[PDB]
Amino acid sequence: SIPASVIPEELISQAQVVLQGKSRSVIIRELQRTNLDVNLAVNNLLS
Amino acid sequence: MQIFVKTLTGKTITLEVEPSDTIENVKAKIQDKEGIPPDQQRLIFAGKQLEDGRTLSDYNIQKESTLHLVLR
User: Which cysteines are joined by disulfide bonds (chain B)?
Assistant: First the structure.
């Protein structure tokens, strides 16, 4: 996976703003799973 | 009643709606304005996905409330 430390915070923040209540760590894990495709990560977490 | 619909990248879509509008009605207004099929839209308010047949009333959506649009 891509290391957490290299994920731009803007991608985490985009997910956070939609997924009120979700932690950064859940979002980071999903972004790593989806190759930083934030749209796919947020869809995955919504479903 | 003006509301805002923010896309995932933080772009604002300003809409004029009524509290009695269903979520499906709101998706059709987004289709009209933005060209996005209702069947591809997920609308989120305070972290929860909104149900197509339920009105804005059922979510206490008010003037200047912000929804989030995610495409599926």
Answer: none
Element (H, E) at A10: helix A9-18
Give the A window 5-44 contacts with B, CB below 8 Å: 14, 17-22, 38-39, 42-43
What is the resolution in angstroms?
1.9
Closest CA to B32 of B60, B48, B13, B19: B13
Partners of residue A39 in chain B, C-beta under 8 Å: 8, 70-71
Contact A33, A15 (CB under 8 A): no
Question: Do residues B52 and B27 make contact, with C-beta atoms less than 8 angstroms apart?
Answer: yes
CATH number assigned to the domain covering B1-72: 3.10.20.90
